[PDB]
Design an enzyme around this catalytic site. Structure first.
Site, short mmCIF file in Angstrom:
data_model
loop_
_atom_site.label_atom_id
_atom_site.label_comp_id
_atom_site.label_asym_id
_atom_site.label_seq_id
_atom_site.Cartn_x
_atom_site.Cartn_y
_atom_site.Cartn_z
N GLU A 186 -5.39 -8.23 -2.16
CA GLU A 186 -6.49 -7.72 -1.40
C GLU A 186 -7.73 -7.65 -2.29
O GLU A 186 -7.76 -6.89 -3.29
CB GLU A 186 -6.21 -6.34 -0.83
CG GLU A 186 -5.14 -6.33 0.23
CD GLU A 186 -4.81 -4.96 0.84
OE1 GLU A 186 -5.71 -4.12 0.98
OE2 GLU A 186 -3.63 -4.75 1.18
N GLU B 245 0.82 -1.22 0.00
CA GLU B 245 0.00 0.00 0.00
C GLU B 245 0.86 1.27 0.00
O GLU B 245 0.50 2.25 0.63
CB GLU B 245 -0.98 -0.12 1.16
CG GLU B 245 -2.06 -1.16 0.84
CD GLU B 245 -3.37 -0.97 1.59
OE1 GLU B 245 -3.92 0.20 1.56
OE2 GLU B 245 -3.85 -1.97 2.17
#
Lengths: 490, 162, 490
Positions: free
Chosen positions: C292, C170
């Protein structure tokens, strides 16, 4: 045995007929002698165009013809080719005659005689925006204007229709030595002023990459995709180095294998250029147009290198057959291709010598494969024998389509000149039984070709060397051959 | 500046007379009389690609064409030879106030259509920098070197301020 | 009737078992209570890990587990989680307790107990190059060094093996708010010092895009492709706006359709990201890793929004089933995926409440589809009924694979909650005849879910509502269902 399964009920796409397109430049004897002989020639002709060639090309079902294409498009000023014959511009070099007797009216006439779509390229490199705008207006405008009125004066009352319009050609090289970034800006500007007059709908084509210039494709798609209907691609099969390409006949076995390997490189090029197009145009709105392809050899001994005259052998037939198969496989994106060039120039379908002509092995492949034009591609999968000195090449290339009347055509190339090729074809998804006929094109020599004295050494013949026991079609393809099987239900 | 000297274009200002009595034929003749090489600069800033191409053809083509035929009507039967050909001048200033990046693109395009006719061999010269504009030289070399035989440079000795 | 043809003999690729991966972050009760209870918890446990969950996950055949992944990976300093469990770092917020009792040794042990591959993400955002280098050394080095000696003192004599190593997570957001250009540079630098010790082989994974950030993929591929084995991608199915996502249960029929439409967007994302990868990596060396994915709702009423606890209905089962089908279809490039998150967080397979647990409908889909793990994907084509208020959705999603023992698995999702779905399946390329059994997972409520009090309202049941008349399998799929058919030759 090579193995193939045809899912005769799974359509994977449409083979746009324009895949079978052609291209002629004002170069050598492509236009002058090849097609255009003049109305008062002793060569039998229709309105100035030799009948032998017309008939052959009609039989072949030529779908589209690109003119003036090549380097000449970005040299040409179209106004030099309209109006009274004798006020048409004349250029004579003593080292080559351009009299401009063949111009816009003659080209559009030629296309109407052939029943093919015209594909014109305008001049970006040495032309102006107004000049290109006016050419489209001249051709397509139904109203009152200097350009439309001029067309009427010159003998065409109602406008023509034209879809395919090229906004420059070869702009990275002989069309202006342009960076892609720069051509993209000129493209955007030029295309702006090419109008849809009457009920005409233009199909604007931007000049795409040369060979493996992927950067060009990226830039044109990124900067100009919203302003184009198609993007071109150029790839010539050149056996040797530029300075010594090799001959059309009397070549070595190494030259055979290299030629075919280089031809099959088309698949990689098309794959990688398409992948870039996908990034910017995921729905595949924009056509890929391979408007220059085919073999390029040293000219025939004692001919002017500038006239690009080369013979045409069964090698050239294999190149054409395999390359058309590659376009089939990419018929989701590739929607037109144009072999270089139609007559007396590069990989021609026809050669002429005065009033004599011949059909090349390349002609025969186009003529045999015309069954694929606007056909539905069928799902096939295959596991093929290898060939060539290192197993580098597929022994067999195969493609299957369904025609409008429901017939199925299976075309097969055997790239090995040395031995035949066994192929087992399994047909799934059929209702009835089927019967099959076949045609094959082959030769006893690796460089087998037609001459004016012997125009039929290499030509299609009935093909009977297969057995169809409902479901399986086993075939023995001749060495160095192109074969088409027609299946009928019943 | 070509054709019957009396029917050539005339510009007169009262604030200077250009009658174009000195044009291509007169210049080429002057160079023959002096025994010196001609070095002509074509118009990029306000000219067209066709215009520059035709000038070269007019001067150097031995065959039959509108331009070569026009040269013959104007009194010069055989072509001249010329090597040095400038593809624009002062294009950073009075020749179009061009960025180097942009002139390089025009240079590449214009030079394309300047042909070698007969046994004539062109020496294509790109417009180079003014004084200490090193960026210009870098851009023209980087983007256009393969398309030029020469690159110019300008520097005047000016004692005081402009 | 939706129609399907399975070419039981045409393999189109391998479904990497890691497509069935999972992900756990130090967030809410995913690690603490969900997995890690501690050794002297009254919850039955093996070495501190609750047995109920272990057994469920082993049964589901968990292939890979990603930790600490999510935002925590680029906050974590791994040395805080090793050494004597009692004298390791403690962080407490009253606004959440991190005692670091679950660290590297516990994670590696968990993976050994489950028989799954560990997938660790190192800290780029707030970490240093030496820190990440030393983590790999600690874990994998067999020799003598401060880090390997420290591992030995901490109770693991021989090194562990690990392949999957994430070099930040991220990084565009909570991992440093980095520009792609900048993260690529840090990626290149960090990865340099991640060594292969002993016989260990690292599979370096670069942080990829969030959702439709195609620019990120382009930059990472163009600047870093030679230095990575895999590139990640994140996409959450969020029904409503961020501030008001909608609930896991008691949702409207509109929320059903929106949910499923947003889930199917995954196919577009994956298609477009892969397309960009193809441009820079035409041979598809580099794995795409969707580490994810899953549904993200408002938390259950009166729970901490920061703990991300949400229920899990038959809607969630359909999202999982359809999404895993999309991964199947992209198994030429997608080689790992990881649903967010394992226990008590977002779209979990398991919820816990002290010693009680349940299996969610999502668990059941993973358990039913485990037959697809490392299976060979088979060529199918389909023509399916539409559903949804505008015909926007496919009524049916179907996938077929061949297991190692030669059995064939066909999984089918009916996205319509309102009516069943007829499916006719034709099987081609079989030798023998086949028999078939079936399992289905469905519910009588659109929001049907399991609770601790009623942990089996929604679970797999025998499926018998189909007929197999040699060649054709006709099936009547229940409303809102996920079904698997197992076919055996004989």
């Amino acid at each position: 045995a090579s193995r193939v399964v045809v899912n005769a009920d799974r359509v994977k796409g449409t083979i746009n007929r324009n895949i079978y397109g052609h291209f002629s430049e004002h170069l050598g004897r492509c236009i002058y002698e090849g097609l255009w002989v003049g109305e008062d020639s002793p060569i039998p002709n229709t309105n100035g165009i030799r009948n032998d060639v017309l008939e052959a090309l009609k039989q072949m079902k030529i779908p589209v013809l690109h003119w003036p294409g090549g380097c000449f498009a970005d040299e040409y000023h179209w106004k030099d080719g309209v109006g009274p014959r004798e006020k048409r511009k004349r250029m004579v070099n003593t080292h080559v005659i351009e009299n401009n007797h063949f111009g816009t009216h003659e080209f559009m006439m030629l296309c109407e005689l052939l029943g093919c779509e015209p594909y014109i390229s305008g001049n970006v490199g040495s032309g102006t925006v107004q000049e290109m705008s006016e050419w489209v207006e001249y051709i397509t405008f139904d109203g009152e204007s200097p350009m439309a009125n001029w067309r009427r004066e010159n003998g065409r009352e109602k406008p023509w229709r034209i879809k395919y319009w090229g906004v420059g050609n070869e702009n990275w090289g002989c069309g202006g030595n342009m960076r892609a970034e720069y051509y993209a800006d000129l493209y955007r500007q030029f295309q702006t002023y090419l109008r849809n007059y009457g009920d005409n709908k233009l199909h604007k084509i931007a000049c795409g990459a040369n060979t493996a210039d992927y950067h060009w494709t990226e830039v044109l798609m990124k900067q100009a995709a919203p302003f184009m209907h198609g993007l071109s691609l150029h790839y010539y099969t050149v056996p040797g180095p530029w300075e010594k390409k090799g001959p059309a006949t009397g070549f070595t076995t190494d030259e055979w294998w290299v030629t075919l390997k280089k031809a099959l490189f088309m698949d990689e090029l098309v794959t990688k250029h398409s992948a870039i197009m996908d990034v910017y145009d995921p729905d595949k709105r924009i056509d890929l147009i391979v408007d220059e392809w085919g073999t390029w050899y040293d000219v025939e001994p004692g001919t002017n290198p500038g006239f690009l005259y080369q013979q045409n052998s069964i090698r050239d037939a294999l190149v054409a057959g395999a390359t058309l198969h590659i376009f089939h496989r990419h018929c989701d994106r590739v929607r037109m291709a144009n072999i270089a060039q139609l007559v007396n120039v590069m990989q021609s379908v026809i050669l002429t010598e005065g009033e004599r002509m011949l059909l090349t092995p390349t002609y025969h492949v186009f003529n045999m494969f015309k069954v694929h034009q606007d056909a539905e591609l069928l799902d096939t999968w295959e596991s093929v024998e290898r060939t060539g000195p290192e197993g580098e090449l597929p022994k067999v290339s195969v493609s299957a389509s369904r025609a409008a009347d429901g017939k199925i055509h299976i075309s097969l190339c055997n790239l090995d000149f040395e031995t035949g090729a066994s192929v087992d074809i399994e047909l799934r998804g059929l209702n009835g039984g089927v019967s099959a006929t076949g045609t094959t094109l082959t030769s006893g020599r690796i460089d087998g070709h037609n001459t004016f004295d012997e125009p039929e050494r290499v030509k299609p013949a009935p093909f009977r060397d297969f057995k169809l026991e409902g479901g399986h079609l086993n075939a023995s393809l001749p060495p160095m051959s192109v074969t088409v099987l027609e299946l009928t239900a019943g």
